[PDB]
Design a protein around this ligand. Structure first.
Ligand code: ADP
Ligand code: ADP
Ligand code: ADP
Ligand code: ADP
Ligand code: ADP
Ligand code: K
Ligand code: K
Ligand code: K
Ligand code: K
Ligand code: K
Ligand code: MG
Ligand code: MG
Ligand code: MG
Ligand code: MG
Ligand code: MG
Lengths: 339, 339, 339, 339, 339
């Protein structure tokens, strides 16, 4: 009914990529241990300070229709990752942005983006198989504490509290988080009360505790892989083994291969160092060796406790790859007229 | 009641042709195996990515009144083709655009567009008779699988699932598509669950599965002709045999004869090659020989499985020809004032 | 109550004649066998393509108040002709435009437009008497078929269907038209189902079938005269016989005499030839000889079947003449201020 | 849903710092004995004249979205300090502004604001421990009178009335303030009636009496420290003893160390003298020696009666530090479009 | 002739003070060893980078008429100081700004600014007498080297070159500066060639060499006092000894007494430390002890070589005080209308 504006070819792709880049640049400043926070103005009260990828993504709406379409697709990526895992939304956002950019710049007159998407799906399936091959189950409560601490932005006390809750009520016991009226966090028999002074602080801490609980639930329901994005880096040889069916599938496989390095470079970049050199030295190093951004040095991640649930990284990669690959098949964009 | 703007002669025809060209150019980028997708912004939620001709056509509304009139007529073509067949909307759209363009360009002071329309109807009846003469019934389930795969953008798994459903519940059994909550497609006794990661992917896959089911229902209800637009190409000698009654009917017959080459040229164009040379080599080739765009070579279509239901192409040609021929008879266009 | 704008003399007449000319030029492109169609944008859905004079006239509303007054008067002419006959609206529109133009052009300081209107009424009464003298009753079903075919824009099948209906249910039997769900027209016992592919096509065909039914009902309720506007051309000697009472009545008689040639010239003009030469050759020819526009040659009207009901032409001439003659008497025009 | 504006890096930090500086500069003109008042226009009646920090803070709302975000955060600081103590809102506001300013000015590419916030929390915990170590309980009613007088802007009669009320109904007795209909303050058995001539005067006096009652309740529920900001100045050696864990924690500790001098400097500034010299001479002086701004000379605070509840200063420092340190971690600010 | 705008009272004073503050804030960032540079856009070529006070002052012209009047007066101060000394323009600018500010702030209905100006003149005469009493003549070439190095922004090579030139051509010999075509500075028999790479660098170095030569010429023509603004700080007791004749002269004497501390505070402020504490510790210290900003510690000025010509400081103080005191007598300002 309403009048529509139709955009063709690389112009619409460029506008959507600008929107995706804006949303992903806003989200990616909160990734890793040395990541900052984002203040979102709240209409009815005090602003909200958050380090969560999905919370930042869902709060960004753009005036331009095509940039808003791209932003909405990235929000879909982040929301799907949040609902199916509870953690890993920033990683999914950066992976989706990388895949979308790689697919957009590789579109030519003779290229077939549908077969590129197919090759992306096969590459992601291979990477997921490698990740499942590289997982190790959680056998000790210390691993649970390490996972909770890593997912709580390196907070020892949150991990200790979650480990105590899992010891008290069992590994599969019901655990919930409710805001506390005191300065410190406490545990009741499980119910977690979050300490703080203002509502913004308790909300940020509650978001981090919820992320830690979701991540440790995923880590106990599935295996454990290395942290820092190195688990995704170790799957490049799996893609090297695969053979393409045609040129477009080769393009998609190379897109996924280039994207697999993105989380580690983002984590290093937030730490103030050069991500490319860090990733190159990680790949040249041994399989057990990774990069600690908080300490800023190459260590053994299992010993240091830098580990991630394999479910979180698996679902983040899958959602980001699927949505971005579907996006790259675009040729025409139809939007409503901005009345 | 409301004030009206009245436009005469070739100016209104040019404006309506511009609207038709815009809508058809938006639609035609999704035709054939190497066709891209279209993102349509949704008012209430995430945008919709589709490769369906009728879905793209129905979502385009223009501000200019005359361009909107042309777009509405092309939307009528696409909607009628979708309702009476369930597939072939893009072919009907491109055929309607071609017929409208040729009819508009052949209008002179002494020309009679009504007799041109009559000649167009005679030519289309002859082509439909030839298509019915060239059909072959479906006798093996492998033909059903080939038809479903071709109508599902070359997806082997969709064709296999539909063939399994037809084996289990019979050729005339009740089959429906419902969105799945898992990663892969599954069959229940028939009900199809569509796999995916996000809603956009499952919606696109559901649209393709519905297209495949409608096309295979048409293919079992009627005969089978060659794919790739070659079946419509083989009917040119039938038009050569026909004799006109006057000059206007000859003009209409030549309009239909030139339009018959449009689908194959569009399919080749989406593949990144020159449509004219492909169509010429197809016409010089044997009757069984057609052009495979995915493989990009001249093959035997029945052996390779590039086949189409004759009902789909028949109704697409009929609807497009009727509506476009009625359009070409225009001399005056009356629209409402854009208050 | 509301503020009014008052216009005097030839300026208001010129504006009103501009409005009348616009509406009549829009309507007259659909007159005769070689007439085109008009697309009218519909607010709630798809546009409507029509060849009907009254349908085109009723859909034109002008922003300018005086042009809209003229257009409204021409719409009155067309609607009265449609209601009292069911056919002949385009002929009435062109006759009304011609009479209004000649009446406006012949107004001077000493001229009396009321006596000119009186002379117009006497001339039209004489022409109607001549038309009644020249009529011949319908005695054979072939005449019914010819009348239906002529009134259905030369469609043989519509005339055959209507003749079959009149044979089945009698000449005065109840016959109605309802839209069909199939490709071809069919008859039930009388109910007519109209075939087609899209709603626009069935609507145009329904309008033509309704026109044919109304025209054949008029032709069976009254006599038959020659088609192509020749019947109105044959009444000029009747006006030559008449003697005026004063100068103004002579002016009116000459206005009607010049207007009597309008329909044939319009039919020839839509055929792409010179109307003046065709009318002159018809007048120099024999009484039985007329001009076939579809064949583009001078033939015998009765033998070829180009015949019209006398009631349709009689009422079209009467309505057009009355309204236009009343129109030409204007000196002052009062309109509302365009707030 | 609504369109959002996203600002990155130091620009958003500068805008929020401008908003914070505006609100804190408005608030800080009312600190100390030589502080002025603020008139806030009331929509429904006469304006309100107040010397209360939270009342001034809550009444300032800025049009610019980022400045409004900063102002809202400072309002959160002031409101939390008012709710948890009843007094010390101006001190909390100035401390929060100072901490936010130093945190913003120390942000670099390699700096980690989260670890800076951690160091700030450690330093504040150390300062709170020192304040608890330096407290002395209230043992005499003269101390209650001194605390009430200090918190009532040096009003002897308010302190005398509150001391009489505490003698009559006990230290923990229920005491409330109600506006009086007479010129002078009176006490009933406890209910305080505030004297005055106009509603503005009685409102200002009621605000000061409520502040005095809350402060003396805190002073009787906890210990007593030196006034004039000297108690917060005496805790710098406690920070000197502390050792950092890394560079960012050292930055945070130095931020808190520099902030600890803010209240005394502001009190001196409102008195028309140089705050830096006063603070330096206070630090060089003995522990019991502080600066009397009303007398404008260095005296013994306990003997002169310049004392503060330790709870008020403790909670003001804690709230200001927490909220400001959370603010300094900002990198991206998302606001609504000013429609 | 041209229309005039007249401003009365404190509004014009505030506008002129804003202009003076703008110019002085621009100039004062280049004072002391830790002073930055100023880039002034040149109309005909590359911009000019300078650390010279008069060069920055003369390049600032304001659009507002009253601010431009204040800026023009400060430019007069700087130009007179440059012409009569060759050095000390920044000190004169900051002294003039301080005197103007205190004079403007101390104007009341009963105050007499003319007698305040008189008291300022007596105070400045007393300070000049103290400066002449505290001077010591140059007896060694090492003192010449120290003076040249101090006036050349601590450049050892410039001081060495100037000392060599004075050894070669005598203490009163003719010495000039000409731009060099080589990378390093050289001396010919005296002519100084300034090294560098581009014109901006050689221009900045030439300005510093000219400043050093003018300062050492003044230092040999007159005595030597302590650097860092300590020489002006040591004259406060001389003002303490003076007795006023009335209240306005006391106000002027206190204005000069407060202004005498400005250069040292500015030098400390440019070094990133608190000027008030540095000045207080300098005044509490011994007469020979001053503050080295480059080393950032309290040292012996004569031994370290931080010395200034007494003529430069004397003329800077005299010019600044005279012009600013004349300015403070303002009551009415008349400007031209900005056509
Ligand atoms: N100390 C550390 N050194 C290196 N990498 C780390 C460290 N702590 C966490 N990480 C990595 O940073 C990621 C956490 O980023 P986060 O902000 O939680 O993004 P998301 O919410 O998308 O998981 C984890 O994948 C983890 O591997
Ligand atoms: N591999 C192939 N090679 C050549 N032509 C193909 C191939 N696959 C499908 N086609 C042709 O492309 C058409 C399908 O286009 P499609 O996007 O479904 O348009 P529509 O929806 O109008 O049918 C079919 O008519 C088929 O003949
Ligand atoms: N083949 C023909 N040759 C010449 N005149 C024709 C022919 N067919 C129809 N006509 C004339 O054209 C007229 C029909 O015009 P039409 O579009 O029906 O206008 P209206 O609706 O006002 O009758 C009839 O009066 C008839 O005499
Ligand atoms: N005579 C005085 N000399 C020095 N400091 C004082 C004097 N009276 C009060 N103060 C200080 O001023 C502060 C009171 O400021 P106030 O306006 O109450 O701010 P707040 O409402 O935030 O406490 C107290 O902390 C007290 O230490
Ligand atoms: N190392 C130093 N430590 C302290 N003061 C210094 C040092 N070097 C120079 N100064 C002081 O800084 C002043 C030089 O400032 P400058 O930029 O030359 O201003 P101006 O051009 O007005 O003299 C001198 O008066 C000198 O006393
Ligand atoms: K994050
Ligand atoms: K399609
Ligand atoms: K007509
Ligand atoms: K206050
Ligand atoms: K300088
Ligand atoms: Mg996380
Ligand atoms: Mg299809
Ligand atoms: Mg008709
Ligand atoms: Mg108080
Ligand atoms: Mg100098």
């Amino acid at each position: 009914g309403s009048a529509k504006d139709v955009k063709f070819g690389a112009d619409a792709r460029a506008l959507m990529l600008q929107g995706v880049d804006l949303l992903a640049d806003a989200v990616a400043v909160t990734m890793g241990p040395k990541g900052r926070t984002v203040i979102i103005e709240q209409s009815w009260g005090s602003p909200k300070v958050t380090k969560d990828g999905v919370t930042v993504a869902k709060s960004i709406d753009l005036k331009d229709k095509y940039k808003n379409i791209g932003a909405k697709l990235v929000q879909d990526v982040a929301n799907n990752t949040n609902e199916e895992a509870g953690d890993g939304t920033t990683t999914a956002t950066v992976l989706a942005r990388s895949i979308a950019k790689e697919g957009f710049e590789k579109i030519s007159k003779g290229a077939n983006p549908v077969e590129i998407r197919r090759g992306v799906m096969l590459a992601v399936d291979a990477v997921i198989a490698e990740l499942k091959k590289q997982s190790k189950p959680v056998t000790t409560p210390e691993e649970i504490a390490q996972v909770a601490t890593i997912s709580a932005n390196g907070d020892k006390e949150i991990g200790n509290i979650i480990s105590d809750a899992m010891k008290k009520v069992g590994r599969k016991g019901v655990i919930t988080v409710k805001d506390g009226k005191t300065l410190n966090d406490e545990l009741e028999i499980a119910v977690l009360k979050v300490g703080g002074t203002s509502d913004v602080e308790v909300n940020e801490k509650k978001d981090r505790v919820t992320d830690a609980l979701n991540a440790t639930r995923a880590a106990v329901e599935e295996g454990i892989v290395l942290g820092g994005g190195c688990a995704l880096l170790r799957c490049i040889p799996a893609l090297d083994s695969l053979t393409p069916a045609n040129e477009d599938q080769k393009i998609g496989i190379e897109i996924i291969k280039r994207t697999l390095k993105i989380p580690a470079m983002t984590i290093a970049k937030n730490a103030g160092v050069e991500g490319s050199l860090i990733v190159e030295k990680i790949m040249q190093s041994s399989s057990e060796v990774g990069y600690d951004a908080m300490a800023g040095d190459f260590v053994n991640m299992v010993e240091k406790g830098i580990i991630d649930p394999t479910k979180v990284v698996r679902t983040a990669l899958l959602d980001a790859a699927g949505v971005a690959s579907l996006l790259t098949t675009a040729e025409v964009v139809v939007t409503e007229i901005p009345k």
